[PDB]
Amino acid sequence: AHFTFQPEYGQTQKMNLFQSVTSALDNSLAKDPTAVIFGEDVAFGGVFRCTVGLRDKYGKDRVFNTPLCEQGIVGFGIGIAVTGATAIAEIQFADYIFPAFDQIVNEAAKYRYRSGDLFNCGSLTIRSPWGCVGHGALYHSQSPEAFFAHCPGIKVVIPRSPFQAKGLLLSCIEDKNPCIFFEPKILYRAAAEEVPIEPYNIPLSQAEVIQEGSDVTLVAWGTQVHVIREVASMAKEKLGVSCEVIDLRTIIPWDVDTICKSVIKTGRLLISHEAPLTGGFASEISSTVQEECFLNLEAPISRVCGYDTPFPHIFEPFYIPDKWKCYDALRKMINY
Amino acid sequence: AHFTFQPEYGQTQKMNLFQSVTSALDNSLAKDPTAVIFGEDVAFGGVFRCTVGLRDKYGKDRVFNTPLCEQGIVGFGIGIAVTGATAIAEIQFADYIFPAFDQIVNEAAKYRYRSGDLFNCGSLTIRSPWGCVGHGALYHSQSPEAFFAHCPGIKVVIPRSPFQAKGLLLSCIEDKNPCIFFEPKILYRAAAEEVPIEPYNIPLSQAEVIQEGSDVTLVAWGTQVHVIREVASMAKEKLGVSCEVIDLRTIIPWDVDTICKSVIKTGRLLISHEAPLTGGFASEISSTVQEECFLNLEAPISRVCGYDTPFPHIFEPFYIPDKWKCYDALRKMINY
Amino acid sequence: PQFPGASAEFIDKLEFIQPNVISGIPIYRVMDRQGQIINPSEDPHLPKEKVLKLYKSMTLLNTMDRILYESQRQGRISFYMTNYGEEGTHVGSAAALDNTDLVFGQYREAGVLMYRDYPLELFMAQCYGNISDLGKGRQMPVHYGCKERHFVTISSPLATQIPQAVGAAYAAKRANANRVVICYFGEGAASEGDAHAGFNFAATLECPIIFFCRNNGYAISTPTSEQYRGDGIAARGPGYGIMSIRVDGNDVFAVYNATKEARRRAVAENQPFLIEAMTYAIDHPISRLRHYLLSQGWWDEEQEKAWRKQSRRKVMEAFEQAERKPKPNPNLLFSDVYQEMPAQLRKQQESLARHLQTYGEHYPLDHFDK
Amino acid sequence: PQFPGASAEFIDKLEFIQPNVISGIPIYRVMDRQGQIINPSEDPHLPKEKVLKLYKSMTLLNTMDRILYESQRQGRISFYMTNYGEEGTHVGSAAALDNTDLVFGQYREAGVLMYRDYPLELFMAQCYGNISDLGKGRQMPVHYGCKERHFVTISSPLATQIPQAVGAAYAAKRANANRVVICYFGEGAASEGDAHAGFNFAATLECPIIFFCRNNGYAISTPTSEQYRGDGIAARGPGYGIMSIRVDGNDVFAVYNATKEARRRAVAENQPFLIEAMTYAIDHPISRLRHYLLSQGWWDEEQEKAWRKQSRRKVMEAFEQAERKPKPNPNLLFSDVYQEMPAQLRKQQESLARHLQTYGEHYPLDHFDK
Ligand SMILES: Cc1ncc(C[n+]2csc(CCOP(=O)(O)OP(=O)(O)O)c2C)c(N)n1
Ligand SMILES: Cc1ncc(C[n+]2csc(CCOP(=O)(O)OP(=O)(O)O)c2C)c(N)n1
Ligand SMILES: [Cl-]
Ligand SMILES: [Cl-]
Ligand SMILES: [Cl-]
Ligand SMILES: [Cl-]
Ligand SMILES: [Cl-]
Ligand SMILES: [Cl-]
Ligand SMILES: [Cl-]
Ligand SMILES: [Cl-]
Ligand SMILES: [K+]
Ligand SMILES: [K+]
Ligand SMILES: [K+]
Ligand SMILES: [K+]
Ligand SMILES: [Mn+2]
Ligand SMILES: [Mn+2]
Fold first, then answer.
1. In chain D, after which residues does the backbone break, taking C–N over 2.5 angstroms as a break?
2. What is the rounded distance in angstroms from the CA atom of residue B315 to the CA atom of residue C350?
3. Per the count of CB atoms within 10 A, which of A6, C361, D152, D194 is most buried?
């Protein structure tokens, strides 16, 4: 495997990431009688098990299958939400969100603005499996967040763990704005961690500094947080370099203040993501940090990203911005 | 109006931008017997007149109306192109390209790669009206280029004038890769210029330095080139500042070398575009220039872009990155 | 034959199923062009007050259209779509709904609002983007919306409202609302992928929705011969399992009757209905209804003249007031992007205010509020 | 009735048109489960060599499936979709095409390739992403393609190939090709917006295309009761003006006959045809054909045994060779993104080569070519 997963709210239970999604969804349906969950194959529990047991517990009218039509799924969800009801749509793989792109970008995102707040689809959340999985090739690997980051009026949120996933998904579901929640599918069955049984929230638009450091700031999200955590460890052991490791968590609106404050301290930034470099979200972070922290920068901001190709099958091990790529970039940046 | 339009190949004729598109299309159909043009309302000459006379000249089998379905129009075009025939699809407003997003991003862009070059849709071009028009509000104003810039396998091209439009459109039509050509609709009937009657090409992935300068590099595309040309004039007269003015022309793949060479000389860069700031293409240019020209930068790279909202109706004059906004940003940057 | 996908016999000869397009689904009509009821069993016998409201709503819409169309030709407003030929489809269907049934539509639906007593002042406020506009001047003209009157704000992208209308209907089912959703769209818009989505979802998910397709034979320049090759839109409904009918869109009573029966059954059965109303893209709904009124003794030329005058005055008073109002505060360009305003969006707003403090003479500040 | 959108009479009574779903379009069948021809006028009388090729193509596919399914369960390959239950729809339709008719499909179409003599070595090369793969190892297993055999490379996103197939057909019309395009998709995929696009465009643009919908009653876990409410996919065709038929997908002769007649008419008339083949999601096409062979005196248990053995050997020889081949040069991750390689993409490739020179011990370099 290319990563290693490692590491107040009442009773907890060990949960993997799919279970933690199920738990968030269950808590949501229990406390919100309007809430419904729908999409392709969600009734029998979903192709990644995220809705197991929910239809039996809550009823066929609340956990149900749609026809095979992503533009429909999203338009339908918007419609539920326009009435004030909580609509939790599933898109089976993030790779298949694009049919719904017009509904997301021209409708959901603009719904409140264009109506002067007479109508909204704030109670809509779209969740979808995301990111590489070792062998998913072009259409089971994609990381689409940068496509949505250019669209004012939607929130895009990506967790790094089961604890984070449940708190962030609850916040998406309860947030008064249409949210896309991308679930890193490689983590669904990876290692478990303790997750509270009862509902709790992790705030949107807030990055989390998971390790403090003074020489360089490393920023990522999803599975890639675990890659940069390992890179921090490699840098410490091999170079005596102290790395501040930050999980961005929310892509938009993003936590500009946390990232800038870190870079003012360290004077160096490396941003990493599986998505292709060109037009990737790292370009927005780099641009912004350069604008706010120009005088503090000791070296050029580094982006270690996937290459500007479609996501390959047999070449995946050569494509991903792995720990060795991140490490080397960091080494050069420190030597600048 | 918010802009002013101003300014070897055989016989020329004065043409506005729509006429120049018509002329490119006519030349294409004359010399390529496979070429067909299709989309909504193209048969009677199009809602912006870009196909006037073409059906009468070339036949109903070559210039024809489709049903009202953008996902169909693009899928259909891909299909024509898979056979080796030239397919020139029209999307009526760029704002309505999003239904076709899955066909563009998951199909057209990946067609060659995923087949190992057994199949391709290289002979596909999608042209669409683009950019603000003074009163187009949410759905007749959009600049979608940054959404497509994150997709390896497509080319995105935007002209600033009738001469440029015809040469760039011919190159898109003849290029062996699926191209999106965005036509700045505010220019369709604005001022004419001399355009060659016969076919000619302007290269893709090449920026054009339209005015040489030594104090600051200004970069834009489309109508915004005319805004920065005026800003250069304001800077010279009011501040004694020499501005190097660059039309990017091709969004992807973009001419990194031309922009970096300019910034190595001037030490300052301001990038401007009508599209919203966050996730806009200026972030890619800023990031990259920072990476290549770190030691040459005398000041933070400026982005003067539209705000991070949907494109408004009555507030348009306050929304656009006009000459005064660009000028002020430049003033501050020079004073840094 | 034991196949899960379909219920059918075997057949031992090869036979393709042919479309029946030359002999299509017939066009339901209640009154002829002289305003006479053809079949008394089909008379809705609407009371005089209601029939006059239908007539006045249709003619007031037409008066508004004339004034605002001219305003657009002069560039006083930036865009306008008229309702000519669609007055009867919209007022007749609206009259068959309950006042709280939620409406989705697009560009030809102003008559639904007019029937529901939407103020002339607010139609005009939207078209002028003035301070009275509850849409805060953000959308192009004729993109109307009213929460109070259950009329979801129009958007330009065609057919997007179709699967949305279905979701709203599904929600109303769950709420045990005894409410229907109606969704208007043209025959061109029916070519969009989102129409297939909406039709199919409404059927499989058993939603109380009326699909109301206006077929006027054209989508901008495109005749229906280039739009589809089956028997209009009505003939698609059965293939989705949707109860369907075609009606004469120049006959308010045909439209009313079809809509009233669709509404009754949709709410009771939780099943979608499709109505395809045949109109002309522009023997008019207003004339036909006028002949009906005369035959009952319910109108005359004196009333016609006085109403023409009164309605022109009401429209001109609203028009003049609308033109004189200021536009909203430019600060409103930044609100409602999200419910709350993100800090980075507030920063852009502050950047605008700083810019206008220095460069304000170059902006139309005197036309905008505060 | 003078309406441009439709050809129809008036009707003076209100009547909704009902779907006929309980008595659907009948299922065309040529032979019963014991392999007997039901109606001699429907016998295609295919010659013995061809019928044996149908049989052997179907059983070789099934043998391949068994071996590769197991390989996937063991993680030797990363993904696999079987053809079980779909052998007859694919081989029977493929046999009715001209060898140069262009095929678009997705995941259940390997039998078309097998019929067209695609080498076992190349099916396996794609599934292993090895050096022999003309797709250069870039796509997931079973995403086959062959230019030489006019079989357009499969992609994962469902229904995208439908409007593409229509464009290719339009192009073939213009080329005066005397060529058809066939487009395969499942009943689930037919719910996508792109299926509505494709169907409608083929009709209005008059394209020589056969739409071949496999209806096996399920899309992953979703039964057709949750997928649609009309009478399968066949009943949608007439609403688009498309000639339609339903066939028994376990009967190679029914499939062949429907496809052969659709092809004949599509090329001649420039009009689309829809075939909906009813199958089982997994009284099998191979058994039925086997009974037919026996009744003609064309096969026996000795031949069955020897072919089973020979085909297992051929598949195992290809499987073993495929597993032993190296994967392609990692440089191939960068080519064919565009036709040419942009300079900035070459820079990324050079960056990879520099990285592997230093960190190469951490990568599986010994498994990849050069
Ligand atoms: C997705 C999209 N594509 C194109 C347009 C441009 N457009 C505005 S109206 C129209 C024709 C619509 O025809 P129809 O639905 O039949 O309604 P009608 O105008 O005839 O009432 C078109 C193509 C649009 N608004 N949205
Ligand atoms: C656009 C998209 N959405 C979802 C998927 C995931 N998916 C792969 S196969 C399948 C079911 C397809 O059903 P059907 O078309 O009936 O074909 P069958 O598998 O029954 O042969 C789904 C939903 C996909 N590949 N593409
Ligand atoms: Cl007037
Ligand atoms: Cl429009
Ligand atoms: Cl006044
Ligand atoms: Cl000025
Ligand atoms: Cl085995
Ligand atoms: Cl899949
Ligand atoms: Cl070997
Ligand atoms: Cl290692
Ligand atoms: K939400
Ligand atoms: K091209
Ligand atoms: K709409
Ligand atoms: K596909
Ligand atoms: Mn129309
Ligand atoms: Mn199926």
1. 282
2. 16
3. D194
The question of whether B212 is a catalytic residue gets the answer no
Q: Is the CB–ligand 1 distance for residue C216 below 6 Å?
A: yes
Report the DSSP pairing between strands B12-15 and B193-196: antiparallel
How far apart are alpha carbons D223 and C3 in whole angstroms?
12
Alpha helices in A103-204 (DSSP H): 111-114, 145-149, 162-174
**Domain range summary for chain A, segments of one domain joined by +:** 11-207, 208-332
Chain B neighbors of D200, CB-CB under 8 A: 67, 69, 72
Burial group, residue D331, by CB count within 10 angstroms (0-12, 13-18, 19+): middle
**Bridge partners of residue B244, in order along the sequence:** B217
Q: Do C129 and B314 touch (CB under 8 A)?
A: yes
Task: Please give the residue of chain B at the shortest CA–CA distance from C348.
Answer: B307
Look up residue C76 and give its two tokens: 């006083």
CB A287 within 8 A of CB B159: no
Domains, chain C, ranges and CATH?
1-370 (3.40.50.970)
Alpha carbons D85 and D279: distance in angstroms, whole number: 7
Which of the four CATH numbers 3.40.50.720, 3.40.50.970, 3.40.50.1000, 3.40.50.150 does domain A11-207 have? 3.40.50.970
Cα of B241 vs its chain's centroid, Å: 28
Ligand that lies nearest to the alpha carbon of residue C71, given by its number in the listed order: 3
| Amino acid code (one letter) for B159 | P
Of D145, D163, D171, the CB nearest to B83: D171
> In whole angstroms, how large is the CA radius of gyration of chain B?
20
Report the C-alpha gap between D335 and A193 in whole angstroms.
41
How does DSSP assign D301-327, residue by residue? HHHHHHHHHHHHHHHHHHHHHHHHSPB
SS3 B312: coil
Whole-number Å distance between alpha carbons of B156 and B179? 6
Helix (H) or strand (E) holding D121: helix D120-128
Neighbour-count burial of C204, counting CB atoms closer than 10 A to its CB (0-12 exposed, 13-18 middle, 19+ buried)? buried
The bound ligand whose nearest atom lies closest to the alpha carbon of C64 is: 3
Resolution in Å, one decimal, please.
2.0
Q: Ligand 1 pocket check: which of C140, C143, C220, C282 to mutate, most ligand atoms within 8 Å of Cβ?
A: C220
Say which CATH topology domain A208-332 has: Rossmann fold (3.40.50)
